[PDB]
Amino acid sequence: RQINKLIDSLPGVDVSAEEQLRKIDMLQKKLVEVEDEKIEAIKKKEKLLRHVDSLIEDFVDGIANSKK
């Protein structure tokens, strides 16, 4: 019964291979595209961090011109 459960639990096999190869190629394409998207997102986040930096130097200039 364990053998029956295992042969029924194996992934769906096919008599042809064009399906598998097609899947492989598609997955490669998705990999490239998602990599590019990652690059763009990183760039945007960098820009925002630059902005809030700018705010911080504003504050530092404020207190520096203040207390002393």
Place this chain on the structure above:
Amino acid sequence: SNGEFIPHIFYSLHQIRKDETLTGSIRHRLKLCKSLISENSEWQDIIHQREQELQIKRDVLDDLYR
């Protein structure tokens, strides 16, 4: 300083000015007044400075929003 300890001296001083222990008590309170005042336009200037800090920071945040 405290202003409640001064009329108490002025009452007896009035009595003495109208007429050793009386003037002795008067001096005994006057010494406490000496130590009190000794322990305890200008501030306006200072007020403005403190607020100067507050104003600069508010302007920065206003730089973020606008």
